[PDB]
């Protein structure tokens, strides 16, 4: 007669129907991705619409069971994971307006072009911003892009922010930033309870420790770019936005040819060594399976080798040609990837097999809990596999590098620098962008000072100065893919922290004596059973408890990140002696 058993029966029925409906939707999506046609696209759209209708109907029906009467914790968590409405809180008119604005912004961002040659975003602009080293050739493209796309998305983004705030207020929240940070909200005991407002205080604390390393890296990059840009870089100033190897500056990996510690000893590439042995896609997948079994993980399913499309189809099928790990359900785990015999694809195979093994872990949990702890766990569990499989020891153990090779200091320094240009260089950008979006959604930044405060944060946090003045008529934040299209961006910082946390926790448990970046979890079963303890829980427990099962801490920790690049940190600190680590927030390339 109690509402607890009624809610349990309702959740059982919902899961029983979802394990079929979501499975059919995922099967339709996979059939569309295999052979992109019109009929498959229509079937996928119909399946997705049916699944969304079922989910919203069940959410509307589940709101009649308040969590105060539910005593069982898992049942309460399952009910909370479903009572969340989301976009259905708004009325029909507001929802239609928000959808139209989102679609218009997506169409403008996808069909954007910059001409005074005449190219588009991906064909010409990306290649120029990645490879070209001329000042004007990059400046004109950057200015044209952030003047066209920004001024075309500003009036739509202004109303998009208001509509998202209205949706958040209708969903019992305050602002869109709190709704996005609500994913890291945990519930449990006195020690396993996390609040949304605590993330704002913890992110800044975690970023305060990575400041000296980022300052040294920025000083080194500036000193190395002073050569190629003699009359465009100040000795005690910031770096232009169009000289970061990217349109926005998210990844500084394109600056490796210009910023190299030791050019006479390039990085290690096993492409030719893999081609000589006669390997292929199936060999790479078998080696990845062997690596994942050696650490002590469950064995791959048979359907992974028959139903999954591991290689590019030669039957004329048009695939999106990008890596993805699909979990259709009921024991169906597939990988859709443009896999080749290259090294980057070799690492991406292990990265996706990590997500697959993650999906194969929480399958015993109910459907309402078949997901990671948060958005920063699912993508970080797979990254540590690629980090541990790209070591010179694993390559020699598998047979890609001969035994006569020995680890050199200059090669390790170059590898650490190339990894920091991609991992350490994106954290300040992510933090600054997320702080800006949070302060804009919260209404702290007036609508007449968006660009001013944006560039001030670019000067103070990322240390990036604009090459030309941009007033409030532009909208450079909206020029990003994650900002134009509705998507979260704070997940990348948490992922970068949690991957190093997991790496250190799994390397200290195997009693490894050496550098953190040279760890090797192979031939160590104790490193797997300790990891699965977190992989088998998923969303059934708060993320703090799942994090405690691996590293012991119940919050973010940046000490493993600083310990990962400790030799590189010392090398940069020793090389940047004849310079000033930092940047003044007054220099301007446009000003005389």
């Amino acid at each position: 007669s109690l509402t607890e058993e009624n809610a349990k029966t309702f959740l059982n029925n919902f899961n029983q129907e979802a394990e079929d409906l979501s499975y059919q939707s995922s099967l339709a999506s996979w059939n569309y991705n295999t052979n992109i046609t019109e009929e498959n696209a229509q079937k996928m759209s119909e399946a997705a619409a049916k699944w969304s209708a079922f989910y919203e109907e069940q959410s509307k029906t589940a709101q009649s069971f308040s969590l105060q009467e539910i005593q069982t914790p898992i049942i309460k968590r399952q009910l909370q994971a479903l009572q969340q409405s989301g976009s259905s809180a708004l009325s029909a008119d507001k929802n239609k307006q928000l959808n139209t604005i989102l679609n218009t912004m997506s169409t403008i961002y996808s069909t954007g072009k910059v001409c005074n040659e005449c190219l588009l975003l991906e064909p010409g602009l990306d290649e120029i911003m990645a490879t070209s080293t001329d000042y004007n050739s990059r400046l004109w493209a950057w200015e044209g892009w952030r003047a066209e796309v920004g001024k075309q998305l500003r009036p739509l983004y202004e109303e998009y922010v208001v509509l998202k705030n209205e949706m958040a207020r209708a969903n019992n929240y305050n602002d869109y930033g709190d709704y996005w940070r609500g994913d890291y909200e945990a519930e449990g005991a006195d020690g396993y309870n996390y609040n949304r407002n605590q993330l704002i205080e913890d992110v800044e604390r975690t970023f305060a420790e990575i400041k000296p390393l980022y300052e040294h890296l920025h000083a080194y990059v500036r000193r190395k770019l002073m050569d190629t840009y003699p009359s465009y870089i100040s000795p005690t100033g910031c770096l232009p936005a169009h000289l970061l190897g990217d349109m926005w500056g998210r990844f500084w990996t394109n600056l490796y040819p210009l910023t190299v510690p030791f050019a006479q000893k390039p990085n290690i590439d096993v492409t030719d060594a893999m081609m000589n042995q006669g390997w292929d896609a199936e060999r790479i997948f078998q080696e990845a399976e062997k690596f994942f079994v050696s650490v002590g993980l469950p064995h791959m399913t048979q359907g992974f080798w028959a139903n999954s499309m591991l290689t590019e189809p030669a039957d004329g099928r048009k695939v999106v040609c990008h890596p993805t790990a699909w979990d259709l359900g009921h024991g169906d785990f597939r990988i859709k990837m443009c896999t080749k015999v290259t090294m980057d694809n070799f690492l991406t195979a292990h990265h996706e097999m990590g997500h697959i093994q993650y999906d194969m872990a929480y399958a015993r949990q109910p459907f309402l809990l078949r997901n990671g702890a948060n958005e920063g766990f699912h993508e970080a569990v797979g990254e540590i596999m690629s980090l541990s499989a790209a070591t010179p020891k694993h390559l020699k153990s598998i047979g890609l590098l001969p035994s006569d090779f020995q680890e050199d200091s200059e090669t390790e320094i170059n590898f650490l620098l190339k990894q920091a240009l991609t991992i350490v260089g994106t954290l300040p950008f992510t933090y600054m962008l997320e702080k800006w979006r949070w302060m804009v959604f919260r209404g702290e930044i007036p609508k007449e000072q968006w660009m001013k405060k944006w560039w001030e944060m670019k000067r103070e946090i990322v240390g990036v100065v604009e090459p030309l003045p941009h007033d409030e008529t532009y909208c450079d934040p909206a020029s990003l893919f994650h900002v134009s299209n509705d998507y979260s961006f704070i997940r990348y910082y948490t992922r970068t922290i949690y991957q190093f946390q997991f790496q250190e926790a799994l390397c200290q448990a195997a009693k490894y004596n050496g550098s953190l970046h040279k760890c090797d979890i192979s031939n160590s079963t104790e490193a797997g059973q300790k990891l699965l303890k977190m992989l088998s829980l998923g969303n059934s427990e708060p993320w703090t408890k799942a994090l405690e099962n691996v590293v012991g801490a119940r919050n973010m920790d940046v000490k493993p990140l600083l310990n990962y690049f400790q030799p590189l940190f010392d090398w940069l600190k020793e090389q940047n002696r004849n310079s000033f680590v930092g940047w003044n927030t007054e220099w301007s390339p446009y000003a005389d």
């Binding site: 399913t301 139903n307 009921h330 785990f333």
Partner: protein
């Protein structure tokens, strides 16, 4: 079946558990809550018999598995089901055990 073998059904909800060797073929709506169901499905009125989505794309834990249970009954009545008896060859002009 590729499209789906929805011919096999299974009971998920019921008032109480069954007894040893008991069969239930009722198709009545499961009265979950205090609301008296009137043959229609909805809130607190769910259908007890659900269907299997058997498809070849499943893994090893959701594929159809056929299970047979052989139970032996040895009541006081005389037994009429004995195992296969063995046999041998015959012997001539020699005393053996028959």
């Amino acid at each position: 079946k590729v499209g789906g073998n929805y011919n096999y059904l299974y009971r998920l909800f019921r008032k109480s558990n069954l007894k040893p060797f008991e069969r239930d073929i009722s198709t009545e709506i499961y009265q979950a809550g205090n609301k008296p169901c009137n043959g229609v499905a909805g809130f607190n009125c769910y259908f007890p018999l659900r269907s299997y989505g058997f498809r070849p794309t499943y893994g090893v834990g959701h594929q159809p598995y056929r299970v047979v249970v052989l139970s032996f009954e040895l009541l006081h009545a005389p037994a009429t089901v004995c195992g296969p008896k063995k046999s041998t060859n015959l012997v001539k002009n020699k005393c053996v055990n028959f």
